[PDB]
C-alpha cells in the first residue's frame, strides 16, 4: 500500500511494502533480482552430461527416483510441502529434478525451482527496521522463498563493507544481497524461527553453489514476521555492534543475554 | 574466524 510490487513483476506474486511504523520510504538502496547473479569470474559447472538425473515416466513419486535417493528420499508430499520428519536441525541436501531427468516439468520433486507461491509482504518492524511478513495461512513445510543476491568468494565476502547480508553457501563461496537482492534480504534474524533454509540443487549441481531455499518450520498465522536463526557466525561478529531485538524468551543474542 | 559476519545453514 506504499508499493505494490517491490519485486517489478518478477516473481511469481506481487510483493507489496508498507509502512506503518515510521517515515522511512520503502528502499530503494539496492536492485532487486529474482535470480542469483554474478560479478566476477565463477564457471559454474553447467555441463548437462554432468547432470545426475532421473528415469521416471511417472510424476516421481516413487522411491526408485535417483533424484530422491540422492536427497535420501525425495521430501516433498504430494503439495509440495516438506514431510513432518524432515531434519530441521540439520537438514540433508535436496536434488531437486532437471532439465536431464526423463520426468516432466510438474513432477513432484521441482519444488523450489517452481518459484514463490505464497503472500509476502515488505513491511516496516518495530525494533529490527524492515522485514518480511505472510498475509496468509502457511502451513508447517511450505517453500517460502530463495536466498538470493551476488555470488561472491570467501575471500571477497571477507573484505565486504557492509556484512549485514552475507549468507555462506558451506574454500567456500556466498551470497551477498547487499547489492543485489530479492525479498528475502528483508528477513529478520529470530531466535525463535519459523523458517529454515536448506541448500537445493536444480538447473546446476556444482556443489560450491547450493541454492538457498526457505521453507516454514511450523504453522506460520496471517500477519506473523518470518524469521530464521542466522546462526553464530553471523552473531559472534555482530553482536559487538547491535544486539538482537527478537523479544524471545529465549532469546540468545540480547543486551541482556550476552551481558548474563 | 572470518573478519565479516555471515549467516548459515
Ligand atoms: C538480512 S538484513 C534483514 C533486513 C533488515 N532488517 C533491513 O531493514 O534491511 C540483517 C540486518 O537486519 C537487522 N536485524 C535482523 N535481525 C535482527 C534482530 N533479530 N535484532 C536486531 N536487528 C536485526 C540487523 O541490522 C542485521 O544486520
Ligand atoms: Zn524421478
Ligand atoms: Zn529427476
Ligand atoms: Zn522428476
Ligand atoms: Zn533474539
Redesign the pocket.
Given at each position: 500500500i506504499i508499493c505494490r510490487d517491490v519485486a517489478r513483476g518478477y516473481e511469481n506474486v506481487p510483493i507489496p511494502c508498507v509502512n506503518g511504523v515510521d517515515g522511512e520510504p520503502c528502499?530503494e538502496d539496492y536492485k532487486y533480482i529474482s535470480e542469483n547473479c554474478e560479478t566476477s569470474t565463477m564457471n559454474i559447472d553447467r555441463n548437462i552430461t554432468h547432470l545426475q538425473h532421473c528415469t521416471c515416466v511417472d510424476d516421481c513419486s516413487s522411491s526408485n527416483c535417483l533424484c530422491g535417493q540422492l536427497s535420501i528420499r525425495c521430501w516433498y508430499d504430494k503439495d509440495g510441502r516438506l514431510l513432518q520428519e524432515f531434519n530441521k536441525i540439520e537438514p540433508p541436501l535436496i536434488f531437486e529434478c532437471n532439465q536431464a531427468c526423463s520426468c516432466w516439468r510438474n513432477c513432484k520433486n521441482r519444488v523450489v525451482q517452481s518459484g514463490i507461491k505464497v503472500r509476502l509482504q515488505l513491511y516496516r518492524?518495530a525494533?529490527?527496521?524492515?522485514?518480511?511478513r505472510a498475509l496468509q495461512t502457511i502451513p508447517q513445510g511450505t517453500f517460502i522463498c530463495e536466498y538470493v543476491g551476488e555470488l561472491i568468494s570467501d575471500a571477497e565476502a571477507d573484505v565486504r563493507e557492509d556484512?549485514?547480508?552475507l549468507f555462506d553457501l558451506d574454500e567456500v563461496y556466498c551470497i551477498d544481497?547487499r547489492y543485489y537482492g530479492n525479498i528475502?534480504?528483508?528477513?529478520?534474524?529470530?531466535?525463535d524461527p519459523n523458517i529454515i533454509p536448506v541448500r537445493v540443487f536444480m538447473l546446476h549441481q556444482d556443489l560450491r553453489f547450493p541454492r538457498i531455499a526457505f521453507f516454514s518450520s511450523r504453522d506460520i498465522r496471517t500477519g506473523e514476521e518470518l524469521?530464521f536463526d542466522?546462526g553464530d557466525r553471523?552473531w559472534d561478529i555482530?553482536s559487538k555492534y547491535?544486539?538482537?531485538?527478537?523479544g524471545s524468551e529465549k532469546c540468545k543474542?540480547s543486551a541482556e543475554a550476552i551481558a548474563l | 574466524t572470518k573478519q565479516t559476519?555471515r549467516?548459515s545453514t
Open positions: 528502499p518492524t525494533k529490527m527496521g524492515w522485514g518480511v556484512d549485514s547480508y544481497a528475502s534480504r528483508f528477513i529478520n534474524h529470530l531466535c524469521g542466522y553471523f555482530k547491535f544486539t538482537c531485538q527478537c543474542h | 559476519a549467516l
